[PDB]
Subunit: 246 residues, 6 copies
């Protein structure tokens, strides 16, 4: 259910032009990050390259990797725009389209994941794994690039999120800080959770194993979910049990 | 119960001079970070600017902003001094006044919050939100700048701390790593906790909603607090219940 | 049960030469990080120096400190090699010896701890504490340098790990994201856990106090362990109780 | 008399692959500068961006500008290849096609001039003048972007070269360190020299005013040329007079 | 004959605002370098700090020093404004007040000299000599900070300019690239030239010893001046002799 | 005739300890550049690595190259100390042993040349040529690494110095800014000057061809020397003729 990419971009530029006027200390930042770019794809590649840069691998090098991915699969940029909207609609602290793009590390991590996922599915595993782990240090989100994640995702606050190799996260999911989608121990093969559409996961929840969390479900903060959660229910506790409906 | 600013500074400088002599590898660091500065405010702005610097906004620009805030509200520097003492008095590993200022990302994150809170209350929201989110990536602490936080606060270890827009933290509070002061929903308006004076919050505790944690209470590690906690009580478990007295 | 250092290194170079051919965008990274170095110690000091570098302390300065430590206690490099193997044998996502060394922040943090532990035991506490806290910001692991940690350790994902001053972690232990090995409150002296050989600690587990976790035990994700756990037992829940055996 | 671009590039990659094997310390440099790039244009934009980067304008931003220029006028890349050959054929110290491209600041400055000249002729004077003056600090060559400069040029050693706004330098010219192509004083309009094809200019020669230096002439080191020099003549002295023929 | 500081600044800001609109690629640069600053002094300190920054001493540290000098002697900022006008009025390529301030290393070197001269006259010689020599590597101009230099000075192109300890340069002087105001020996005491008001010095001129160059004189490019030059005379050649009148 | 290396080092450290006390703004710089190092070799490698660092090749990488050269030929460090003394004795503006080491780009260029010369004579031509050209951009001195240069050399001011492949510079030579020791045109084989012991070369002199400048001779500023200069004479003019004795 996402608004048009080109429409979110225009909104973003309009907000930024206006914001640059009312805060002179950030005008340079708004121009470099948003206003000089012709499209959302180019602003995204610039941002990720600058934020992921290190002595190990410079921004100029990261950018050409991201630009190649976006040139080959421009739907990733459309997913970014859907992710921007997800935050704006769901987070009461965020009114502007430009806010997630500019500032939120969960959003940034989610878009870096898309690049890593594109690389991994092309067999460019080394580069995907390089990026995954540079994202873990820079944005404190560790998503394996083989995980299958949809669009309209919000990674709220985001610090300490861990998502495993064989996880699936469907559209419109909201995930808070310190959520693990992980295994049951020294396990192998299909071993990580399947999070269905519209699920919200509270802070510090651990969802472990190849188990379903059904569509529209709510996972309580600090839960340890070891069995499947039916659609449209609230699961909570250690271990998690059904405590209501959302 | 907080001693004078000029006095902690003199102590800090005394410690640094002596430390520079016994560790030649750190002498340059002690001089740049502390000894060439004429006051704590100057040392704080330098440190925050250096640690928050990135490709997207340099140390030289961040320092200007911090210096402006400290010039307009120098009580923020007095709060920093109380925060240094808090760590020295409560953390048994730390015995020197210079230690929180030099090394501890919780202390730095708390002082960065103060600048953001000053900016936010001046209507300079873009800059406060920029700082909040750079603090999140740099020190792994995500405090909304509209949160109202007192002095004599310890953020022990600090990684993964998240504090919401409408939270309150009174004086002399101690918070550990991975503590969330968050919402219950999908919530709007006044929706985050009220942590009263002298409260201690254990590692990984989630305190959710507009609920009081009474003064002198102890929140257990890994707790999920969903109802108010009376003063001078120990609350623990998922969900939290009264388990005793400090 | 460790493969010899020199064999690990030879395999590392073999993998990297082959990987550099199949991914041109990372060839420079592989040559700088691995292929130009004559031994594992050289590569580790270069990597740690580059990854911990900041405005307050440059790579060139950090490298000198790490090289000194490795010259005085070369067994730290053998511990690194055991740690590489640990990840390779236990993590189904990792097949190559080069992977932990190149990418995993848990591995990097563990090797940085070794340098800090060496400095701390030489009485060079300032420098040990500088490194501890730079590792906290860069890799999001906070290990006090006085903690005693063996070899064959895996810090899986690693973000939010906190280990206290008087903790002990024996050989072949596996620790996940957001694990605290901490105290029970306003405590002093021997106050942190003793983790025995082959223990596995799930995501977000808090182990509090000077309590033992016995040989080969398994701590559940999200547990709050307040009493000792007997060997070869699975403990879980808030608070943790015995739920089975691995 | 220029070898084709694609043949130059193929030779460049061949040399670099071989050189990377025989010097491990530079393998990373060769892969980043040359071997990861699909064509000479890509390598030139990367090199210019990295070498001109500063706090005021990063590599990532400079690269976009250079890539745009090269996309709109790919003949600039063919001029670069002619310039590489010029140095290789004329400089007895240089045997490899890769050498000018990798190391020589005169070559780099010449290619930066081309980008500036392209911007200047598009009316993008601010950006042309930014580049001119960044080239002056980085490579110590100050060429006004309105100067008209051909191909097969060698700027040997290059430091202190100054070329004025209305200068012309035809094909196959060789210029040494500290050469000024300048005016006669407080002047205006067409006021700088016209250097014709195959001219050789010695170290420290000043050529002043809108005067011609004819085809195949030789200007002596330390000369002050104030009148025109006929073709195929050697001019030298202060002021310069005819002393022979090359 | 030098117009007001507040007026040149207002012009500079007017130019920058307009220029930012017609070149989106430089808008960030215009905002960081000029538009976010409240006065010329602030813009100058920022620029000098950014351009002189290096591994050995960061922008944030250099800015403090420059700000202290400008606070103690704000006439240095008025001299900068006269120097901007000098270039605008004398260099036919330059028509905007913002151009010398933004781009011209001769202008920057001259303003860095003023800070060094202030430091030197305060007995802070180490810092003046540090700055002199960082200016030499960054802007390729080497002025001893004890040299006495007036205002309305143009250092045109500027590369390789060298001015000695006991030199004097009065108001309204124009100096080109590779000009040396040096000694004759193996000399001691008062040993460098006295350049009087309105003198013009051509490219590569060497003026050696404690000799006068009289007011309004013109020194020819490539000259070696060893005896005094009377006012309003043109001196040229090796060695220099009187050749006419301006 | 050089003082002992170990004696100059002690002097250097004594000066620096004292200077760090009287200038707090530079204490960090004195500690990082001099006071933390155990010997002159280690301070030199640190300095050259920091000053030559770029996006292209980091300080950490440059340092290991310089350390290897110094470990294999420690006489290079003794030549450095002789060079420090040369400046102190010959330059009236320099009293302290620490001054050349800290600040003078000519001294730095001379020591980088020694590293390049060591590499070139080991057949490591690529790395020697990398360094030569990084020195040309950073210190504005371009010395071919095959040139044979003695000790007790002063490169005064140094900007624009160019020395060719087959040049020789004997002990105790003084060379000023913009001196070229170059060829006669498109020449080959032994083609650059032979500068004998104790020669001083004035600013902007061009000495061209395989010609001798005899011991103790003085070359005038701005001369063009095309024929041999007998020992103990002063040569000057364009072209140079014998004008006296020193
Ligand atoms: C024991 C019940 C714990 C309940 O946790 C939540 O209801 C909860 C709170 C939130 O802020 C969420 O975002 C969430 O998904 C669940
Ligand atoms: C299940 C009983 C709760 C256990 O957690 C604590 O007692 C606790 C609380 C705190 O605020 C701490 O700082 C702590 O170290 C332990
Ligand atoms: C019984 C409630 C939670 C149990 O959690 C686990 O079984 C667990 C423990 C571990 O050490 C793991 O690595 C894991 O993935 C799950
Ligand atoms: C007759 C006085 C100086 C002559 O200088 C040269 O012959 C000269 C000219 C050039 O173009 C060169 O490249 C050179 O090396 C010498
Ligand atoms: C040999 C006659 C001297 C030639 O040099 C100049 O006339 C000259 C002097 C200057 O001060 C200039 O700025 C210039 O462009 C030419
Ligand atoms: C025409 C005579 C020119 C004389 O140039 C010099 O005497 C001279 C001056 C200096 O400062 C030097 O260092 C030098 O070697 C020569």
């Amino acid at each position: 259910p996402c608004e048009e990419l080109e429409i979110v971009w225009k909104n973003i530029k309009a907000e930024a032009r206006a914001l640059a006027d009312c805060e002179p200390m950030l005008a340079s930042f708004y121009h470099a990050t948003l206003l000089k770019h012709e499209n959302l794809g180019s602003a995204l590649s610039y941002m990720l390259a600058n934020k992921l840069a290190s002595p190990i691998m410079p921004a100029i090098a990261i950018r050409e990797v991201v630009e190649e991915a976006y040139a080959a699969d421009p739907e990733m940029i459309a997913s970014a725009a859907c992710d921007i909207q997800a935050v704006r609609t769901r987070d009461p602290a965020v009114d502007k389209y430009s806010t997630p793009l500019l500032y939120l590390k969960g959003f940034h991590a989610l878009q870096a994941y898309r690049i890593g996922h594109w690389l991994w599915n092309k067999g460019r595993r080394a580069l995907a794994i390089f990026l995954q782990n540079q994202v873990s240090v820079s944005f404190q989100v560790d998503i394996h690039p083989a995980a299958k994640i949809g669009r309209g995702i919000m990674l709220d606050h985001a610090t300490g999120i861990v998502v495993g190799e064989t996880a699936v996260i469907e559209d419109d999911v909201s995930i808070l800080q310190s959520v693990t989608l992980g295994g049951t121990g020294k396990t192998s093969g299909d071993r990580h959770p399947k999070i269905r559409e519209g699920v919200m996961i509270g802070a510090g929840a651990k969802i472990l194993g190849n188990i379903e969390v059904g569509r529209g479900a709510k996972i309580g903060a600090g839960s340890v979910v070891l069995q499947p959660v039916p659609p449209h229910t609230t699961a909570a506790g250690v271990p998690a049990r059904i405590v209501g409906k959302p």
